[PDB]
Amino acid sequence: MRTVSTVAELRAALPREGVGFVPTMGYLHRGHLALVERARRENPFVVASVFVNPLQFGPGEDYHRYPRDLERDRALLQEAGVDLLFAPGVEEMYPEGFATRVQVEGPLTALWEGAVRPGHFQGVATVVARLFLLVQPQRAYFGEKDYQQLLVVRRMVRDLGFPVEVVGVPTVREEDGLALSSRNVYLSPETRKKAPVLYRALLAMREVAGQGGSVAEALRAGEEALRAVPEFRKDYLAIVHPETLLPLSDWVAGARGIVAGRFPEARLIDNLEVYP
Amino acid sequence: MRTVSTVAELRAALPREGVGFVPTMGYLHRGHLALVERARRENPFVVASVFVNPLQFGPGEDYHRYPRDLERDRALLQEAGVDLLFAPGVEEMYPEGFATRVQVEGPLTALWEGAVRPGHFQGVATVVARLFLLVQPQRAYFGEKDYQQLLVVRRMVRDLGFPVEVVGVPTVREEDGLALSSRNVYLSPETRKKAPVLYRALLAMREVAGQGGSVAEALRAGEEALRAVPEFRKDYLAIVHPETLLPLSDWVAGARGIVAGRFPEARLIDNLEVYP
Ligand SMILES: [Cl-]
Ligand SMILES: [Cl-]
Ligand SMILES: [Cl-]
């Protein structure tokens, strides 16, 4: 595998066709592997990027302490069979003079994560748009854990006309159900034991739905599950339309249960299709 | 020449390489063909687009009044040699649910035309971004008359990494000096006689520069010229940096004289390299 740190080397090592792309912020885990694994079975050439994007972090968030270990990410991607790793510094990604932004407007970015993290999705859209133009991939892979982000990217691609197939990959979880995330490293041993509550709440709602319960009944079950862990301060818990993310009054195929909140040392999010 | 009005047709008729692109809003004049000509010679396949972009029209502007004559444009590009014409409707370019925007921020879009027409450059960046993504050109041609717009597109291209060479083409002028513009049709025979004041002002400034005068002396000369035609309500007149459009404290190669204002029936803009 070849690792490049500049746009010049990137464009020079890139094939005109057959490129599968996996954008990441580094400190890779099994979940990222699931993405690489999928890109490889569908594309003759796989490119992965590791770049902690400052544009998608808020002032009081974790940009400075975000986990970083390029060597670990390299060996790892190397073993996974990645053809090309793009690991640029902030200056190569955003040179002096950089002044452009891309953003998806409307309820899609205003709801849920958008209300908690103002400016976050504009940062995601901007960096993904740049990465797409630099990589010119045929297919790009994203995890479903960041469901809203997946929808935002799809909207941007649809609107602007990026000839990119945006593929969502199901979330990889620990045995206790905790969705894998680079930020899980922030969890203390004690908090790590309580962290499975998000997925537990989501499963509780899916259970109710499967048993013929109402959306309202499913929501109550989810809320109850979360209350077993007071240390988890919920930002939101809802069952929404799979495409618009608007709260549902009645079930629809693809109904998505979403939840987010924080422990003292980390904020976690998770989601699951709760119907059918 | 093949004419397409949908995205599907467009993608199906486009070759993968050697595409020269000329974006316009219709009602073509000598100047546009100066662009189509340039492209026809440097690229094996030429595509031109005709679309009045509602996004770059703001409050109290001439959207519905903008001149439209598709058939005249067609036959025009036909004889010019263009291989493909993309003339989509508003709904094809911006289908229901469209919510993405692209914008270049900072002084480049806040000064001059940006101050006069707020929201204008976001509309331009957005439509150009989409067109570039839909056409996937190797080169795109723009007229220098809209110099600021030219720099904005170059900035967006450089920032986001579009693999497109943006070509600026010198303005085509009338015998009296009036830069050609599809909006000149708005001028009455009377005000048309006064219109040459813009170029006159620019020339006055270039003359001072050539004589060794200071940047301030050049502006004075330009102010004098406009002062003679009070009918022209000046928006701005300045000598700026060729790349940043910031007012100049002193001369630099490529110094650009820019002017804009409005007669009762229309708004006019023009620019010219005043130094060296
Ligand atoms: Cl983030
Ligand atoms: Cl992650
Ligand atoms: Cl306009």
Please write down the HEC assignment for all residues of chain A: CEEECCHHHHHHHCCCCCEEEEEECCCCCHHHHHHHHHHHCCCCEEEEEECCCHHHCCCCCCCCCCCCCHHHHHHHHHHHCCCEEECCCHHHHCCCCCCEEEEECCHHHHCCHHHHCCCHHHHHHHHHHHHHHHHCCCEEEEEHHHHHHHHHHHHHHHHHCCCCEEEEECCCECCCCCECCHHHHHCCHHHHHHCCHHHHHHHHHHHHHHCCCCHHHHHHHHHHHHCCCCCCEEEEEEEECCCCCCECCCCCCCCEEEEEEEECCEEEEEEEECCC
The verdict on A160 and A211 lying in the same domain is no
Q: Which residues contact B70 (CB under 8 A, 6 or more apart)?
A: B26, B50, B87
Within this chain, do residues B21 and B107 fall inside the same structural domain, yes or no?
Answer: yes
Residue from A141, A16, A125 nearest A80 by CA: A141
Same domain, A136 and A183: no
Task: Specify whether A125 is located in the same domain as A206.
Answer: no
Q: Tokens 């006069």 belong to which residue?
A: B116
Do B134 and B50 lie in one domain? The reply is: yes
Shortest CA distance to B82 belongs to which of B50, B129, B52? B50
A242 neighbors A257 (Cβ within 8 angstroms): no
Q: Does A105 touch chain B (CB under 8 A)?
A: yes
Do A180 and A236 have their domain in common? yes
Distance CA A145, CA A171 (A): 6
Closest Cβ–Cβ partner in A97, A104, A133 for B160: A133
Contact B140, B150 (CB under 8 A): no
Last residue of a domain, which of A173, A193, A219? A173
Identify which of A7, A129, A155 has the shortest CB distance to residue B99: A155
Q: Do B44 and B149 fall into the same domain?
A: yes
Contact (CB, 8 A) for A21 and A126: no
Q: Other C-beta atoms within 10 Å of A214: how many?
A: 13
Residues B57, B155 within the same domain = yes
A108 touches chain B (CB under 8 A): yes
Q: Which two tokens stand for residue A147?
A: 């469901």
Residue of A nearest to B95 (CA): A159
**Listed residues B122, B147, B173: the one ending a domain:** B173
Last residue of a domain, one of A173, A201, A216: A173
Specify whether B241 is catalytic: no
A64 & A164 share domain: yes
Six token digits for residue A160: 């602007």
Contacts of A240 (CB under 8 A, 6+ apart): A246, A247, A248, A255, A256, A258
Measured between alpha carbons, how far is B82 from B48 in angstroms, rounded to an integer? 7
> Residue B24 gets which letter from DSSP?
E
Q: CA-nearest residue of chain A to B127?
A: A160
Q: What is the C-alpha separation between A61 and B34, in angstroms, rounded?
A: 52
B102 touches A: beta carbon within 8 Å: yes
Do A17 and A151 share a structural domain?
A: yes
Residues A121 and A159 both lie in one domain: yes
Instruction: Please check whether residues B135 and B240 belong to one and the same domain.
Output: no
**Domain count of chain A?**
2
CA gap A141, A80 in Å, rounded: 15
A133 with B99: Cβ contact below 8 A = no
Measured CA to CA, the distance from residue B118 to residue B41 in angstroms comes to 36
CB B201 within 8 A of CB B222: yes
Taking the Cβ of residue B253 and every Cβ of chain A, the question of whether any pair is shorter than 8 Å is answered with no
- Cited resolution, angstroms: 2.0
Q: Rounded to whole angstroms, how far apart are CA atoms A248 and A250?
A: 5
User: Rounded to a whole number, what is the distance in Å from the CA of A131 to chain B's nearest CA?
Assistant: 8
Distance, CA of B204 to CA of B195 (rounded, Å): 15
Structural method:
X-ray
Torsion of CA B249, B250, B253, B254, to 10 degrees: 40
CATH code, domain carrying A238: 3.30.1300.10
Q: How many CB atoms lie within 10 A of CB B107?
A: 13
Instruction: Mark residue A174 as left, alpha or beta (left: phi above 0; alpha: psi -120 to 50; beta: remaining).
Output: beta
Domain that holds residue B49: 2-173
Determine whether the interchain pair B160/A125 forms a contact, defined as Cβ–Cβ distance below 8 Å: no
